[PDB]
Design a protein around this ligand. Structure first.
Ligand code: K
Ligand code: MG
Ligand code: MG
Ligand code: MG
Length: 154
RNA sequence: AAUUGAAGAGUUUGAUCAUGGCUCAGAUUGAACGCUGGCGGCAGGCCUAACACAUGCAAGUCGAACGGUAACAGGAAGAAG
């Protein structure tokens, strides 16, 4: 599995004494072949937070039906305030996406894609929107299956 | 063969998500200014005062329309070193 650290953030809660700082780590993991998951870890230290995130990511992986390291069709993904658009691209396009979407698409095994993040670009929600977009993407076979047709008829 | 094409980031908070403005990375120019400055090719060069303008030049040509002959170049006559 390829692993990527998207974001580390210092968060704080107040107590009687003062402030207690801690760290959050957002990570994605993927096999580079249409399997991808994200993880979010919290700890008092940065490396502990990353380790927790990576462990979470490995167990929460979903399957994406790719085509030649690009998408099957244009997809929209939404989570919270994040709305993402992703489109299939030709070979040699590369990942034309912002960093959070790029990390997801790279480990998933999407080599060629045109993307755009609308609304909030908060990494935590962009990653959820992106994976939401990918996981509800249909291949021609499942479309043919559900409609009760052959793939050439589709 | 001839529309293969779309990236985000910083900043409100003790921290958060959202909302929302401000700001930045790009491309561009009849540019200007600062520092610096070797050569070439190709292009470009009053965006303001349609303000005022010295001087030179930017519209002539035809004798195969015409009377002519001021030039000067021949030609013919008539005479002087
Ligand atoms: K903003
Ligand atoms: Mg959770
Ligand atoms: Mg916004
Ligand atoms: Mg502060």
């Amino acid at each position: 599995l390829q692993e990527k650290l998207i974001a580390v953030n210092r968060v704080s809660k107040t107590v009687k004494g003062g402030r207690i700082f801690s760290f959050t780590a957002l990570t994605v993991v993927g096999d580079g072949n249409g399997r991808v998951g994200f993880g979010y870890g919290k700890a008092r230290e940065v490396p502990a937070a990353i380790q927790k995130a990576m462990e979470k990511a490995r167990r929460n992986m979903i399957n994406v039906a790719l085509n030649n390291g690009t998408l099957q069709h244009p997809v929209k993904g939404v989570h919270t305030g994040s709305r993402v658009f992703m489109q299939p691209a030709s070979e040699g396009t590369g990942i034309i996406a912002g960093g959070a979407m790029r990390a997801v698409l790279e480990v998933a095994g999407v080599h060629n894609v045109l993307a755009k993040a609308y609304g909030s670009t908060n990494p935590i929600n962009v990653v959820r929107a992106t994976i939401d977009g990918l996981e509800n993407m249909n291949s021609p076979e499942m479309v043919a299956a559900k409609r009760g047709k052959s793939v050439e008829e589709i």
